[PDB]
Ligand binder design. Structure first.
Ligand SMILES: CCCCCCCCCCCCCCCCCC(=O)OC[C@H](COP(=O)([O-])OCC(O)COP(=O)([O-])OC[C@@H](COC(=O)CCCCCCCCCCCCCCCCC)OC(=O)CCCCCCCCCCCCCCCCC)OC(=O)CCCCCCCCCCCCCCCCC
Ligand SMILES: CCCCCCCCCCCCCCCCCC(=O)OC[C@H](COP(=O)([O-])OCC[N+](C)(C)C)OC(=O)CCCCCCCCCCCCCCCCC
Ligand SMILES: CCCCCCCCCCCCCCCCCC(=O)OC[C@H](COP(=O)([O-])OCC[N+](C)(C)C)OC(=O)CCCCCCCCCCCCCCCCC
Ligand SMILES: CCCCCCCCCCCCCCCCCC(=O)OC[C@H](COP(=O)(O)OCCN)OC(=O)CCCCCCCCCCCCCCCCC
Ligand code: SF4
Lengths: 97, 318, 59, 284, 155, 83, 96, 99, 70, 98, 115, 175
């Protein structure tokens, strides 16, 4: 019963990550395969998420954009492209985006 | 086609050893509530490749006071012996069906200490020298129990032919008859293979890196590959010895399933022990072996030699 | 242990000389006595229980 | 040629043995990175060990003569760096004593709460780091997950992780953020279990005991004469504790049991320290 | 052409070198305990593919973490010397960066770079654990932008 | 009596290992004499025909040896398969 | 359980051995014919090659007695190929 | 022996193994069981001096049985002449030589 | 969670999987479907040499019985 | 007699010479001594295996277990010499003289 | 045929595997790089001194102990003898003497080796 | 080739013996001796002595010579005396490679080598005996007689070994 449900979310994870392409993209680009509700999107492509069910920390997170100030950033990842106003919310310094 | 079978045996093990670094890194981390390698590829699958080809591209610095010929021969013996350890294994049908495979198994395992002694002397440093001397001292203390355990264990088997172990365990696991020896054999395998608490040979915290204190890059993997290859083989040797499996002649596939599944369970409990116990000490290392292990092994050997006679259950030598 | 600070005040807005009692200082001073009668693989053990954080012992 | 000696005991030559001066550390992982411990050894048996220290000696007191009292405060945070607040607790207690000014009672209670929280900080350091070198390294990571939680608490109040610089002469710099006591209350509830993980992991383990029991024992008289302090005396059964005998700050208006050992060896202190964890949890 | 082939070969070496470095934290001061803190399950370097390895003949990057004094100065350099190539040193904390809080004292060399060729300077007193984790990430990005095989091709 | 029981129990308090090994080795030597199966063990051990039982020249008046490996004459091991 | 299983194996072994006992007659006769036939081929080959030797009368009995001696492997396979030599001397010995 | 205690009290200590035609495990023979049995029974109750010359025939035959010197020399001379002849192409080995 | 290590060990099971399968199938393939007839004692060896000579093709594994005799 | 038997016999003889022709390390001398017995152990196996002296398969182990015993004595004397003198040299091992 | 062939293959596999681990990484060793590592400090000149007796004492005891166990490898075939009673008595003798050698060695200090 | 394979193993056995007999460094002498120890086992294996061949690997390669390395690690003469250190060892090593090369050529040509004994240089394979061993390995049955007929040897070998441990501790006790 429970094992079936745990399997059941797994395909739901595939549906959440835009089918196969998004799932392969995020796992090879962020090592994260967990999907949460959309919380915001800046003027950069920095698509943000949030999931209160996860424990403190990983409960809100990010996958970074592909284009940052005329720089390729699909493979590379840095924590500094986060804009200041959203840097406040992401570090849980304020829980309202 | 004997040749292609040989590469079909040594090549998968080397790739198995590479992946053993990843799983051990992750499992040990998981005990520590960590995650282990998961960034380099999906779930760290390419971490063994990353570690392997990074070290290969690192220069093999030879220490100034080293005999280069002496420095190089030791890894050759160490790695070749570890790969040779699998040639008599009863894997479906044993590759080298040596009628005295167990003796061949023990002789090669006991010859591995020459790598430890030679690596310490060739490095020519006090830290490496006493690291090696105690390393072999820990090493040479325990295989006498290994030999005694096997002699008692194999006594009810019938001979030293490794393939015969399958037919002996055709009904029940051989651990049930000699479970005092099973834990006796198991602990001694850690001491031979030098894992915690028997890691004073290397002693990452207090002996820096043991005999690998200097040994770097290129040929360092050889001891690392030989070490981890022995981990599978010793656990595989324990798997056949005590946790036997049924083998249908028309489907050797099935017994491979049982043998393989058991031998990862036996390797898993190896690093499971590592992630729970403090490291031992040289004196306790000898005292435990010579004071509480040797006497018990002797008595159990005495129990197991007379047991077939008092029960008229001697096994056929064939 | 017993971490004490001994300072002498000149009466100005600044201290004159500050002496800090380091628990590790006496403990590391006493490291010689404990180690007598024990092996090096126990010397590491004694160093652990001495709680010798060196910036504390080195003042 | 010389006729043989009458007793047949030909005279022994010069000494053919040495004590093998070994330069332990500083790169050695067990040497904490900065230890120049050099000892004399007859094989594994040791004769004398010289803890050559100074590999970290900074000006410290030398510059304090040039920094004002407020400017000198962050030095103590960096002096016994793993016990952040407990150092600046001493400085503030010292300085306010000269000023003949006592902090408000609210300030005192915050000091002791963080002081014992800092006691949790250090005792976790002392036990887990020791287990690192003795072998088993998983209690290290298990407790370090908790260590972040009070480290996070440090950040919520002072604004920095380690060097809080919170305890200033005359009290504390700022107030606790609203609800901060609630989170540390949640932490306090769950930490008793984490202590049980340590004791279950180590206390009864034979490998842990045999590497620790009856090791490095010292008698009460030598321990006191050696200038030892704190747990060093308490492990040897010495009946003494500063928080009890000379209760500074609020420590008089609180009850706790001092964990006096009864053997003086390393094991007795280890039980004393883990008991100090629980008694620290009493203070919280 | 040869440029494309050597580019792939450089990347193949590049990918492992930026994912398999084994740091050796030369634990000096309060900066060192922070690096053990980013060994905690909270950050767990090993998930990136780096392991705390002693015997600095095995390590690739070495981290000075804390103040560096004249007494510590000559030994620390020798650790850098027999550290095999490729070797990189990351300055942990203000004291290792530029002497920091003890920049004027008589016994600490102002800045660790006076002894070794610092690759990445990490500010902090102490740098919060993930700030160093950021610095390690910068190291791999810098490691990504090298042209070892490319330069030899034009050499 | 009192000393023996106390000493044995007291020894089992400090060392449980050698008393266990001494007990096992103590058993390992006596019951081999007391076992009723040792005679069975040597009987089946003798029963294994490693070598060929070379035929004996039939000159009459040895009825014990059979003239065919099916006759009732000669040694029989009907105990063995039951044993 | 093991004592029953071991007891069963001994019954299996003696059953296996008994088959070999019944198989000795045909095997012994076949090896008997083979070994002395192959010796005769050697003797026939001796008397095509030692005709010109100043002193060589074929069939010399190196042993003075008239009792049959089991033929040494040298005079048996000595005049055969290299495969015959290798597969006979160490053929069983190698057999990994 | 110097003091033949074995003979006096009749406990066999070593002589079970001094020669190869005695009792052997599983009744399997030595290489020269037939010859040495002949030599032994030839030289029993005779004396070392007399048995040296009288039972000479049984000895060198038995020595030749286990050394196999002249037999090996016989084969060597057979082989030596073979390659000293077939290399000249005077006689060709028949098929059964080559299989 | 721990379902992330199964990808690591599943590959491991595959690695140790190969040598068993190869030596089983090569023995089967080389020896005409049957397993490698082992000869731990000289009796079993001279059994094979009879088979190799009696097969008429100089391979022991080729088995041929009642179709021969007359 | 077969060529191989020369190889062990000559192996012993050259091992015998190394045992007698000394140098400055009686440690090296002990190596020739145990090599000396190894040829004895090896050669003894050839005749016994060749001649099928089944009960004589005994002595290769018996010769081993006793030649190995001399190692215990010899090496023990080694450290005894290397304690009153420190080293394993042989020229200095002449205190008797008269 | 196959036995040393199996031995041959592993040795070449090891030697080439170190060969491409030695010439490929483009060895660039210097004097300080090849200098011995001693906890990061200066070596004082060593690794050429005797080490008391305990390491030697245990080695000889192991050697003597290894020789007795060598005497008792053939037990699995010994159980297949016709006269078990003699074999049972004799094998028990080796084990109890193995015990006695351990027993004496224990009682007269021994395994508690020197320090 | 496989014609005279045992000719080979015997040859490395000689050169391995010449190695340590030339008195090289005790570890290097150990290296040369274990090489001879390794190759000698193959000679016994080729004769069917698997159990005897495997033992020398166990108690002589992994046995005696391991504790030999301890004394070499204990002796540690101030400089390695490896082959390049001395010139007599080269002469000893070079010499020991000549006469055995001489007599094999002497034995390979006419086979009438009369050094001390008369010796035939014929192929190693000849002296083998033809005959089945049934199911009982002749080597195994011989050794297993240790506890059937070798009663007397077992007592004396055991008693000496017991006396072996009493002497070793007594001489090493240093009064
Ligand atoms: C060994 C045991 C058999 C294999 C594992 C069985 C398993 O995971 O069963 C589901 C489930 C997972 O349990 P778990 O191992 O505790 O992980 C719990 C998490 O909290 C589960 O909590 P969650 O709800 O967050 O789970 C989400 C999860 C759901 O994950 C699953 O359902 C796991 C199965 C793969 C998908 O999906 C992901 O995390 C996506 C990433 C998946 C990575 C690839 C996993 C490979 C698995 C092995 C493949 C073959 C080798 O099983 C159980 O809860 C009971 C134990 C197993 C029962 C089944 C019979 C065996
Ligand atoms: C008719 C019945 C016949 C048989 C009866 C036999 C007696 C009854 C059974 C007795 C117990 C079994 C035999 C003894 C076993 C213990 C031997 C011993 O010395 O113990 C004490 C020893 C020593 O304990 P100690 O050192 O605290 O005390 C010994 C006594 N003094 C103090 C005097 C020296 O215990 C150990 O060595 C601890 C373990 C060390 C290794 C660390 C890893 C352990 C991992 C455990 C988990 C994995 C187990 C895997 C098992 C196998 C799986 C395939
Ligand atoms: C002391 C304990 C060991 C010796 C006594 C017990 C064993 C006796 C034994 O094996 O006798 C063998 C023989 C008598 O043989 P046996 O009659 O016991 O067994 C014969 C077995 N077959 C038929 C296979 C040969 O006696 C001896 O070897 C005595 C040697 C001297 C013993 C006393 C020394 C002091
Ligand atoms: C069945 C009927 C009999 C059952 C058993 C009854 C006798 C029980 C005897 C118990 C042990 C002896 C008494 C005792 O408690 O001795 C403790 C002591 C501990 O020694 P230790 O740990 O070194 O500490 C002190 C020295 N430093 O011990 C010692 O110092 C003694 C050391 C002896 C060393 C060898 C011990 C035997 C080893 C195994 C032998 C083989 C198995 C048993 C064979 C028995 C044959 C009869
Ligand atoms: S930079 Fe700051 S935290 Fe780091 S060692 Fe220096 S004073 Fe301590």
């Amino acid at each position: 019963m429970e094992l079936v449900q745990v399997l059941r979310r797994g395909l739901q994870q595939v549906s959440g990550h835009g089918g196969l392409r998004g799932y392969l993209r995020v796992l090879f680009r962020a090592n994260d395969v967990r999907v949460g509700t959309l919380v915001g999107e800046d003027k950069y492509g920095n698509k943000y998420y949030e999931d209160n069910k996860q424990f403190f920390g990983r409960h809100r997170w990010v996958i970074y954009t592909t284009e940052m100030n005329g720089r390729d950033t699909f493979w590379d990842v840095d924590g500094s492209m986060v804009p200041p106003e959203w840097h406040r919310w992401l570090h849980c310094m304020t829980d309202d985006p | 086609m004997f040749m292609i079978n040989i590469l079909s045996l040594i090549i998968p093990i080397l790739l198995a050893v590479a992946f053993l670094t990843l799983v051990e890194r992750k499992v040990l981390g998981y005990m520590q509530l960590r995650k282990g390698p998961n960034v380099v590829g999906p779930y760290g699958l390419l971490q063994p490749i990353a570690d392997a080809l990074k070290l290969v591209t690192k220069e093999p610095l030879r220490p100034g006071t080293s005999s280069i010929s002496m420095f190089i021969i030791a890894p050759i013996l160490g790695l070749s012996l570890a790969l040779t350890m699998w040639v008599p294994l009863p894997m479906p049908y044993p590759l080298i069906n040596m009628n005295l495979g167990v003796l061949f198994m023990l002789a090669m395992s006991s010859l591995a200490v020459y790598s430890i002694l030679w690596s310490g002397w060739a490095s020519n440093s006090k830290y490496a020298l006493i690291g090696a001397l105690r390393a072999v001292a820990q090493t040479i203390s325990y295989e006498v129990t290994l030999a005694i355990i096997l002699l008692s264990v194999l006594l009810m088997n019938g001979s030293y032919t490794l393939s015969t172990l399958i037919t002996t365990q055709e009904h029940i696991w051989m651990i049930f008859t000699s479970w005092p020896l099973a834990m006796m054999w198991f602990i001694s395998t850690l001491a031979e293979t030098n894992r915690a608490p028997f890691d004073l040979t290397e002693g990452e915290s207090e002996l820096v890196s043991g005999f690998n204190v200097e040994y770097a890059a290129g040929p360092f993997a050889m001891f690392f590959m030989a070490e981890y290859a022995n981990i599978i083989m010793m656990n595989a040797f324990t798997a056949i010895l005590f946790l036997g499996a049924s083998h249908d002649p028309h489907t050797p596939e099935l017994y491979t399933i049982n043998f393989v599944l058991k031998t990862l369970a036996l390797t898993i409990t190896f690093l499971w022990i590592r992630a729970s116990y403090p490291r031992f000490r040289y004196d306790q290392l000898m005292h435990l072996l010579w004071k509480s292990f040797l006497p018990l092994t002797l008595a159990l050997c005495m129990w197991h030699i007379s047991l077939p006679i008092m029960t008229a259950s001697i096994p056929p030598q064939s | 242990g017993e971490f004490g600070v001994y300072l002498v005040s000149d009466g100005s807005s600044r201290p004159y000389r500050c002496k800090i009692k380091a628990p590790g200082f006496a403990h590391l001073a006493g490291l010689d006595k404990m180690s007598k009668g024990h092996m090096l693989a126990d010397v590491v053990a004694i160093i652990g229980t001495q709680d010798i954080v060196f910036g504390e012992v080195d003042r | 040629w010389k006729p043989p000696p009458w007793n047949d005991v030909d005279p022994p030559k010069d000494t053919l043995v040495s004590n093998l001066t070994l330069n332990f550390g500083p790169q050695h992982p067990a040497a904490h990175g900065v230890l120049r411990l050099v000892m004399e050894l007859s094989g594994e048996m040791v004769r004398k060990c010289d803890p050559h220290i100074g590999l970290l000696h900074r000006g410290t007191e030398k510059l304090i003569e040039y920094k004002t009292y407020l400017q000198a405060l962050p030095y103590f945070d960096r002096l016994d760096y793993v016990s952040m607040m407990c150092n600046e607790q001493a400085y503030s207690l010292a300085v306010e004593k000269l000023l003949n000014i006592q902090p408000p009672p609210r300030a005192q209670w915050i000091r002791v709460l963080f002081g014992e929280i800092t006691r949790l900080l250090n005792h976790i350091m002392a036990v887990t780091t020791h287990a690192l070198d003795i072998g088993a390294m998983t209690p290290f990571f298990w407790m370090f997950e908790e260590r972040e939680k009070m480290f996070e608490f440090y950040e919520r109040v002072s604004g920095a992780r380690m060097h809080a610089a919170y305890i200033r002469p005359g009290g504390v710099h700022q107030d606790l953020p609203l609800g901060l006591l609630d989170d540390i209350y949640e932490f306090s509830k769950n930490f008793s279990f984490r202590i049980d993980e340590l004791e279950e992991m180590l206390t009864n383990n034979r490998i842990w005991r045999n590497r620790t029991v009856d090791i490095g024992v010292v008698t009460a008289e030598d321990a006191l004469n050696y200038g030892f302090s704190g747990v060093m005396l308490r492990g040897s059964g010495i009946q003494w504790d500063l928080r009890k005998t000379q209760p500074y700050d609020v420590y008089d208006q609180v009850e706790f049991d001092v964990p006096i050992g009864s053997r003086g060896d390393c094991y007795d202190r280890y039980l004393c320290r883990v008991e100090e964890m629980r008694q620290s949890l009493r203070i919280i | 052409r040869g440029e494309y082939v050597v580019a792939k070969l450089d990347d193949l070496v590049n990918w492992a070198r930026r994912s398999s470095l084994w740091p050796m934290t030369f634990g000096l001061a309060c900066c060192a305990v922070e690096m053990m803190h980013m060994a905690a399950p909270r950050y767990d370097m090993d998930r990136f593919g780096v392991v705390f390895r002693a015997s600095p003949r095995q390590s690739d990057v070495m981290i000075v973490a804390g103040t560096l004094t004249n007494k510590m100065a000559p030994a620390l350099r020798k650790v850098y010397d027999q550290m095999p190539e490729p070797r990189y040193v990351v300055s942990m904390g203000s004291c290792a960066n530029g002497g920091g809080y003890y920049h004027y004292s008589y016994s600490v060399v102002r800045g660790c770079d006076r002894i070794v060729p610092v690759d990445i300077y990490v500010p902090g007193c102490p740098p919060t654990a993930e700030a160093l984790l950021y610095g390690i990430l910068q190291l791999q990005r810098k490691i990504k932008r090298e042209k070892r095989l490319r330069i030899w091709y034009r050499r | 009596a009192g000393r023996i029981a106390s000493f044995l129990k007291n020894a089992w308090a400090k060392e449980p290992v050698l008393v266990a090994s001494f007990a096992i080795g103590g058993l390992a030597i006596i019951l081999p004499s007391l076992s009723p199966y040792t005679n069975y063990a040597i009987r089946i051990n003798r029963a294994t025909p490693y070598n060929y039982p070379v035929p004996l020249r039939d000159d009459g008046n040895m009825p014990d040896v059979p003239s065919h490996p099916q006759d009732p004459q000669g040694p029989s091991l009907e105990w063995l398969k039951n044993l | 359980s093991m004592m029953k299983w071991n007891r069963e194996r001994r019954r299996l072994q003696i059953e296996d051995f008994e088959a070999r006992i019944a198989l000795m007659p045909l095997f012994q006769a076949e090896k008997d014919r083979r070994v002395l036939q192959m010796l005769r081929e050697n003797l026939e080959e001796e008397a095509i090659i030692m005709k010109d030797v100043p002193d060589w009368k074929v069939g010399e009995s190196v042993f003075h007695t008239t009792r049959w001696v089991t033929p040494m492997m040298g005079e048996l396979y000595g005049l055969r190929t290299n495969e015959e030599i290798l597969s006979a001397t160490y053929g069983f010995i190698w057999y990994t | 022996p110097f003091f033949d205690v074995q003979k006096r009290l009749g406990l066999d200590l070593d002589r079970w193994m001094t020669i190869q035609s005695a009792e052997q495990p599983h009744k399997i023979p030595g290489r020269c069981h037939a010859f040495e049995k002949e030599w032994i029974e030839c030289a029993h109750g005779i004396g070392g001096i007399r048995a040296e010359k009288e039972c000479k025939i049984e000895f060198d035959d038995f020595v030749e049985c286990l050394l196999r010197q002249k037999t090996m020399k016989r084969l060597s001379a057979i082989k030596r002449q073979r390659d000293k002849l077939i290399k000249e192409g005077k006689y060709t080995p028949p098929p059964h030589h080559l299989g | 969670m721990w379902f992330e290590i199964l990808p690591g060990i599943a590959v491991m099971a595959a690695c140790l999987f190969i040598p068993g399968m190869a030596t089983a199938h090569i023995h089967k393939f080389t020896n005409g479907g049957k397993e490698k007839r082992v000869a731990h004692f000289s009796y079993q060896w001279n059994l094979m040499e009879r088979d190799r000579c009696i097969s008429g093709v100089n391979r022991y594994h080729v088995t041929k019985g009642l179709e021969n005799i007359d | 007699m077969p060529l191989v038997y020369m190889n062990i016999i000559m192996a012993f003889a050259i091992a015998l010479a190394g045992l007698l022709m000394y140098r400055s390390h009686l440690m090296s001398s002990l190596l020739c001594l145990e090599g000396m017995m190894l040829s004895l152990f090896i050669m003894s196996t050839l005749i016994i295996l060749n001649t099928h002296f089944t009960l004589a398969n005994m002595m290769p182990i018996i010769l081993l277990v006793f030649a190995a015993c001399e190692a215990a004595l010899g090496l023990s004397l080694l450290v005894m010499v290397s304690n009153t003198y420190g080293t394993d040299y042989v020229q200095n091992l002449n205190l008797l003289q008269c | 045929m196959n036995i040393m062939l199996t031995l041959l293959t592993n040795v070449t596999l090891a030697s080439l595997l170190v060969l491409i681990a030695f010439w490929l990484p483009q060895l660039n060793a210097y004097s300080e790089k090849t200098s011995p590592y001693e906890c990061g400090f200066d070596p004082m000149g060593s690794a050429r001194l005797p080490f008391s007796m305990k390491f030697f004492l245990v080695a000889i005891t192991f050697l003597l102990f290894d020789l007795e166990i060598a005497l008792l490898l053939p037990l699995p075939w010994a159980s297949q003898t016709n006269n078990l009673k003699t074999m049972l008595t004799m094998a028990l003798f080796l084990l109890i003497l193995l015990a006695a050698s351990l027993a004496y060695e224990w009682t007269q200090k021994g395994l508690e080796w020197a320090e | 080739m496989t014609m005279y394979i045992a000719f080979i193993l015997s040859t490395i056995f000689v050169i391995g013996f010449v190695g340590f007999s030339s008195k090289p460094s005790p570890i290097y002498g150990g290296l040369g001796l274990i090489v001879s120890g390794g190759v000698g086992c193959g000679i016994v294996l080729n004769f069917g002595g698997s159990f005897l061949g495997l033992m020398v690997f166990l108690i002589y390669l992994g046995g005696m010579l391991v504790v030999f390395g301890y004394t070499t690690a204990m002796a540690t003469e101030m400089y390695p005396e490896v082959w390049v250190s001395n010139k007599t060892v080269f002469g000893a090593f070079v010499s020991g490679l000549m006469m055995e090369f001489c007599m094999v050529y002497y034995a390979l040509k006419e086979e009438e080598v009369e050094i001390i004994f008369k010796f035939n240089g014929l192929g190693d394979w000849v002296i083998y005996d033809t005959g089945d061993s049934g199911f009982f390995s002749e080597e195994a049955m011989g050794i297993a007689a240790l506890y059937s007929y070798g009663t007397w040897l077992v007592i004396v070998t055991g008693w000496s070994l017991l006396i072996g441990v009493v002497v070793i501790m007594e001489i090493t006790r240093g009064n």
